[PDB]
């Protein structure tokens, strides 16, 4: 009889809504207006979005 059904928790995605913008007056502080990413390479060297 089909009586036993398991459930597993999984990550379906991420929340890509715009984060809270903090005005700091610093020249080297940048925030992406709307959607978009900054391409950076980590310690190993593989590129990725941040």
């Amino acid at each position: 009889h089909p009586s036993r059904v398991f459930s597993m928790t999984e990550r379906p995605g991420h929340n890509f809504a715009q984060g809270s913008v903090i005005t700091t007056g610093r020249d080297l502080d940048v925030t992406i207006e709307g959607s978009g990413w900054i391409s950076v390479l980590d310690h190993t060297g593989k590129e990725g979005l941040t």
Binding site: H1, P2, S3, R4, F6
Partner: protein, 107 residues
């Protein structure tokens, strides 16, 4: 006539089958937690034919990844029934000799 085969009937074989059945049920209960073990059932009519086998039990519920098809609720009931019937077979076969001895000795 007048031979032990006819005097004892089939009660001489039933006691053995009830012992084999009890062994299989004991195996099923012990192997209930070991994954991959398939519950074994004994067909009574097969040992009846052998007197005059070791099958598999199809589960009523799915496994949980173990593959073990032993239902401990079923095994306890089947062990209780076999033990009760085993004692009756001893009573039946035991009285066969008690009547047989009384006929010979006349007392």
């Amino acid at each position: 006539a007048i031979s032990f085969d006819n005097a004892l009937g089939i009660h001489q074989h039933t006691v053995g089958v009830r012992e084999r059945n009890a062994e299989v049920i004991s195996t099923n209960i012990a192997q209930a937690n070991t994954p991959g073990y398939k519950a074994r059932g004994l067909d009574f009519a097969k040992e009846l034919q052998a007197a005059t086998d070791k099958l598999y039990r199809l589960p009523t519920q799915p496994d949980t990844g173990d593959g073990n098809t032993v239902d401990l609720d079923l095994e306890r009931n089947l062990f209780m029934q076999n033990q009760i019937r085993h004692q009756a077979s001893l009573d039946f076969l035991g009285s066969k000799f008690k009547n047989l001895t009384k006929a010979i000795k006349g007392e």
